Amino acid sequence: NNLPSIFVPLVGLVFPAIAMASLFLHIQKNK
Amino acid sequence: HWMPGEPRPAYLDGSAPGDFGFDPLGLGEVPANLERYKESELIHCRWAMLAVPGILVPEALGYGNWVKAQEWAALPGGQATYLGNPVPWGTLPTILAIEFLAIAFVEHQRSMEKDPEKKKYPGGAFDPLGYSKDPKKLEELKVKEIKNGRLALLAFVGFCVQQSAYPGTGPLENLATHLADPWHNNIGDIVIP
Amino acid sequence: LSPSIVISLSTGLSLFLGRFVFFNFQRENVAKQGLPEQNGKTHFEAGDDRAKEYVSLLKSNDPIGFNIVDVLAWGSIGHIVAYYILATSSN
Amino acid sequence: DISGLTPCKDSKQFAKREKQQIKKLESSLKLYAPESAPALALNAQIEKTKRRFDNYGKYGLLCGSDGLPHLIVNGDQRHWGEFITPGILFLYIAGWIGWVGRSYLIAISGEKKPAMKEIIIDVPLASRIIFRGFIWPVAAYREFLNGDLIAK
Amino acid sequence: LRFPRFSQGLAQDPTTRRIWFGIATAHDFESHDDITEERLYQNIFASHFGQLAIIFLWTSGNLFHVAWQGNFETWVQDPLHVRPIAHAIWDPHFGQPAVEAFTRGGALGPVNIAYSGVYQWWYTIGLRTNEDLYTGALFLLFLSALSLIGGWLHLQPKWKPRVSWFKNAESRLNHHLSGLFGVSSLAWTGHLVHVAIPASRGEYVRWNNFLNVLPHPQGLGPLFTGQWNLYAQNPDSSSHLFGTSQGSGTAILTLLGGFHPQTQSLWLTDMAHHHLAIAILFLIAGHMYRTNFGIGHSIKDLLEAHIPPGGRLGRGHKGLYDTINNSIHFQLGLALASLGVITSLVAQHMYSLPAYAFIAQDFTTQAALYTHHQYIAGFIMTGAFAHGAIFFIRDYNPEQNEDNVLARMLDHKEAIISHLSWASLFLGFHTLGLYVHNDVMLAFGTPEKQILIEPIFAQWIQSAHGKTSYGFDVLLSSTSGPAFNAGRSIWLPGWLNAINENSNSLFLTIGPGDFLVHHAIALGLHTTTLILVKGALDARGSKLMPDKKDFGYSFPCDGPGRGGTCDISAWDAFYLAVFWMLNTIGWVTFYWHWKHITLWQGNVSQFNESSTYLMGWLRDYLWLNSSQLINGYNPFGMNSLSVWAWMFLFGHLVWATGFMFLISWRGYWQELIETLAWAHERTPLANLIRWKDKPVALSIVQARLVGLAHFSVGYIFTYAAFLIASTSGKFG
Amino acid sequence: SHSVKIYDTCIGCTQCVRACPTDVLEMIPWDGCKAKQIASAPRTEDCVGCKRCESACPTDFLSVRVYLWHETTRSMGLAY
Amino acid sequence: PIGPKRGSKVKILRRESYWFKNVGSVVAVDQDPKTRYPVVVRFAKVNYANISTNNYALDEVEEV
């Protein structure tokens, strides 16, 4: 099939970046 | 005293019937444990003093030793016998049912009693001939009963041990074998080969 | 070949033994070993609302207080014994 | 034949091992003159190998499938020399050593500076104590019976 | 406030230590701010729900990938000549030779060969097509979703359980024993009888027709009439072919004993009988404790009345009910000890008595399963003692436990520790001495001078089970004994046939090397137990630090005073015990792997002769069997073993990396870090960017954990790569 | 800030205050010992935790105890 | 006089002490009623801090 050509980059490059950005913003937050 | 020159335990004053100060391991220091042990000893002595008459009389009459009477139950369909006559109810499942039910009632009845003196010598309905009227004779009677029970226990121990060394032989057969040539048929040849 | 229906008479024998022989022993053992408790307080009185004993089931009009839980337990023992006897035979 | 073992004298692999070792030793001998000292040393080694194999054959050891002796330590009287007797000898010697050490430690405990007698040994006292350990079992048993062995 | 939300003290840290310690204390609910017992219990309940959901999702993913990208249907027809497929590979970094080399099996692209044994397990229980796996995956997804919904529901105020509910031990024990073990095992027998046994006889039973097929020709009639022997008539013949109706029978409950002739595994009708018997036993035992129906036992009264009249145990077990019930670390330690023992038993039993068809002939799977389960059991065993020490530090109450069994062990801890030390020293001294003596004897060319001792007692035990390879003739090996005569007509024929065949792993033959390795294993176990017990008992204080209980479970030191107090806490005692556990499990796995490799190659004499000295190990196990591993890629090309060699080198790298954290300590690194801040602040075009958290070196306790993690990861990866590659290169 | 405590086993030899690398400890008058003195910790916010005070205590077990606690920019010895 | 006499032998009953359940000799006793630990004991063995002297209260020492 053609699904591995999409899900593998989607899980290995995009989601880690989104998660890292969100986590850095959350841990750098202050009130 | 069980051994002259040896001090007696503090809890064995010599006033109880059949008391000779024998307790090398100190198993009776606890007052509650000692009271139970007398009942157990009396029960064991009374049970063993009935087995000895039933272990020699059947053999002395030529009905076989005490271990041949149990072999039939291992066989499938074996029927019990008494005085050379088979019994109609000698089946294995019937024998166990009456044996368990009959003794499960008497032993539980014995357990429910709470007065310690009655747990050993209940008196009452079990003494029809009135041997308990005289307290003076009662003490010597208790001493006689205690002295004989330990002898019967030792006799049963000998019965059981002799079977292991000489399989398939009866105690009276052992006595007859020893009587013929005492100087070579004895304990010696068994202890050392 | 023993019949299964007749062998199930062991239930009656077990019920008779429970009601007429071993009743006082069981009752006094139960009285001695009281309800389970935590930190000196029973499970219900410590706060557990689902640990309340069922009083309605315990009340029976039997003259000696024979319950239905006792009937169930002794009948279970009788059935177990009867089926063990049935299974052991015919081997 | 305990556990399927065979005697050394009846094992063919034992003889094969002996022959292989002897042949390996004899190969180097051909490189030297008979009168030379290395030839004498190799001859002595060959004789020692033969004597060792004969002695192993004589003592009634048991060989496995590989032609190697095996030791039985279960307590059979036929093999009491492999484990039992050397064990008793070792126990006696170790008890001697321990008793001597304990006696020396106890003897100097009452001195003003006992730590000084531990780095600089009092030779006469130790020598007088050394011979006492020859009867250590009796002293230990009697000390145990009197209740002196264990500190209160 | 900021991250972490649960720690006021950590949230005010101006350094990078806030993040590191914020991550590492998330699941310690006991140390969070404004914590109560009820909130703790509720959080534990929710966490358990989440763990169940995660487990279900993992299993569903495994099934879905096997169905979608595997070769299950073609593997069923020819189990012995097909390699199972785990999943497919899509790596953009691959070169063309890598694409060619990894295209194995019947696949159309690169794939991975599975070594988890899922194929044989699923084939044994009746799964035959790819449509079954999809349905199983869907059902597991539904189960995970249900677990998540159930976990969310109980955190609401309306459905929040109370503390008294969590402390009802008798009802929980009754319900668990009766249903979670008895009813659960009762259902598995039903599944086996209704589906799996017909599947092995060529019958296709599914949801749409299982109400019309009778598992037995006579139905349930024999069960109600007590004629239970009718279910054992006409068993499978010795010529039976698994999966087909040739030579099949009609029985469902048997006591044959032994192995199936073709699959070399246990009979399917034996496992159903076993599960039925254990289900009945568990169902009966679940009626012991007192609940609100007026009958049963009281655990507190059971504990309080088991006190010997002699007084040799002090007050006995009085007050132990409240100690266990009020402490969760005690319960966790007990559960972990039991789970570790059970995992070790599983590892020991699954290799000698296989239950899945065609799994004994798959050599690569057995070793992987054994090593996996043994390492997990070791980790669980360490955790049990760790949580026991935590309980002693945190939850122990000396007043309520006066002079009971728990308190009297703290009285004589010195004797236990000293006796453990003596045993360890004795074992190590003599084992090392014998090994070095054998090595020196082999070095000089006189192998006949070795000290070789037969394992007489183990051989006697083996002979007692019916093995006739030693000529001991005891018990079951004697045809005239009562034990042999009792069971000669039920299970003895099959068991004796299986035990006396020398190709399987049932009671392998043993020699002096087994003696030496067994004593080494005992030494390792004793040393690990000594370390853990010494750590647990001295947790509340000692002569060097009498007030250790006021400083908690984990703390770096007490300063350089009084001679120095490096690694004085119980956490460091646990930290020192992981190395010994790893060493012991490594020895055990080395022994198992070498023995089974020599057995499979048909050259068992090599292990018998070369295992009595350590140079024999180093030369004939590590050096010899690593030739195919290090040739995965060479200056001439690569093959399918490249990934295992890469993992070998990766594990070496990580294991060596752990040494930096383990050997070098903190003060060197803070001084180095202090200069880099100056360099950054004084550099043009770079001082325009500044940090928010002040950089600092790792703390004293943190570095130990990091080094231990690196050590363990390198150990595991390196051994796994070596084992898997060395087995698969030879036996596929 | 770390926690520093003083216990009444004090003998007042002033050894802890002299070994303090910052100004944390001090001596106050007291009754209960021959020296008629006892230590005090009024400035624990300057504590760094090197535990030099415990290295100078002559009492069998310490009459001064330091318990490491929440870390600040002063207790970590940072001069960034 | 208060407490034990000088030169007598006492055993320590303080759990957090290095010389717990050990015997020492009394050197001096302070007679000030406000002193909390007036008994001075000297031991043959040193502790981990290389100190052989300590002060104990009247309730932590007993005559042996």
Ligand code: CLA
């Ligand atoms: C290969 C490395 C190695 C070795 C040999 C040992 C050996 C030992 N460890 Mg150990 N350990 C190691 C690594 C090692 N450890 C690591 C990496 C850790 C993790 C940090 C630990 C953590 C650890 C703990 C926590 C404990 C031990 C303990 C022990 C001892 C108990 C085992 C025993 O029976 O003694 C067998 C004895 C020996 C092997 C010594 C051989 C003696 C020879 C004859 C010395 C000869 C000297 C020389 C030849 C003569 C003079 C010549 C001159 C040039 C010097 C033992 C000495 C325990 C202990 O000490 O208490 C019992 C203990 O509690 N170890």
Ligand code: CLA
């Ligand atoms: C504390 C030391 C110790 C420990 C932990 C073990 C542990 C083990 N041994 Mg073992 N063994 C020991 C000492 C020890 N042994 C000694 C000293 C001998 C020589 C007599 C043996 C001889 C031996 C054999 C022949 C076999 C084992 C086997 C085994 C394993 C199976 C369990 C078993 O049979 O127990 C055995 C337990 C003992 C023998 C108890 C010994 C413990 C005492 C206290 C040692 C005291 C020595 C004593 C002073 C010697 C006096 C002799 C003197 C009269 C000459 C197990 C790992 C078996 C196995 O599986 O091997 C693969 C096996 O076949 N052992």
Ligand code: CLA
């Ligand atoms: C194999 C283990 C190992 C490794 C890899 C290192 C590595 C290093 N040590 Mg070291 N060390 C070790 C063991 C090790 N040590 C041991 C056992 C000790 C004894 C205690 C020491 C004692 C020690 C001291 C005393 C010092 C070092 C220093 C250094 C660093 C030198 C400067 C540098 O950046 O190098 C270059 C780094 C490398 C070559 C490692 C990287 C490896 C490759 C490039 C991986 C790249 C991956 C890439 C970034 C992508 C990653 C993305 C991710 C998603 C995968 C370097 C990181 C010095 C330091 O702090 O820096 C000056 C220093 O002063 N070490």
Ligand SMILES: CC1=C(/C=C/C(C)=C/C=C/C(C)=C/C=C/C=C(C)/C=C/C=C(C)/C=C/C2=C(C)CCCC2(C)C)C(C)(C)CCC1
């Ligand atoms: C009314 C009345 C009466 C009578 C009564 C009755 C008669 C009753 C009965 C009752 C009953 C009669 C009951 C029963 C019960 C039962 C049960 C409770 C059962 C159970 C069961 C079980 C538990 C089982 C089990 C099993 C096993 C184990 C194996 C196989 C399978 C089975 C399932 C079978 C009279 C007149 C006298 C008087 C007046 C009143």
Ligand SMILES: CC1=C(/C=C/C(C)=C/C=C/C(C)=C/C=C/C=C(C)/C=C/C=C(C)/C=C/C2=C(C)CCCC2(C)C)C(C)(C)CCC1
């Ligand atoms: C520290 C601590 C803790 C922990 C602990 C632990 C972790 C332990 C462990 C332990 C263990 C881990 C144990 C084990 C054991 C085992 C055993 C005890 C076994 C046995 C066996 C047997 C009994 C057998 C039998 C038999 C039979 C029946 C048949 C065949 C033959 C034979 C012999 C096999 C706790 C938390 C609690 C508390 C706190 C503190």
Ligand SMILES: CC1=C(C/C=C(\C)CCC[C@H](C)CCC[C@H](C)CCCC(C)C)C(=O)c2ccccc2C1=O
């Ligand atoms: C090397 C070393 C350092 C210096 C190393 C540091 C500060 C490493 C800091 C982390 C760097 C930035 C690498 C991080 C790599 C991770 C894989 C990235 C984060 C992963 C997440 C999952 C956390 C210490 O601080 C130290 C302290 C005490 C004893 C020994 C040592 C020690 O050996």
Ligand code: SF4
């Ligand atoms: S070296 Fe480090 S851990 Fe050890 S005593 Fe000194 S400061 Fe503490």
Ligand code: SF4
């Ligand atoms: S720990 Fe260090 S900084 Fe704190 S009071 Fe003691 S000597 Fe001063």
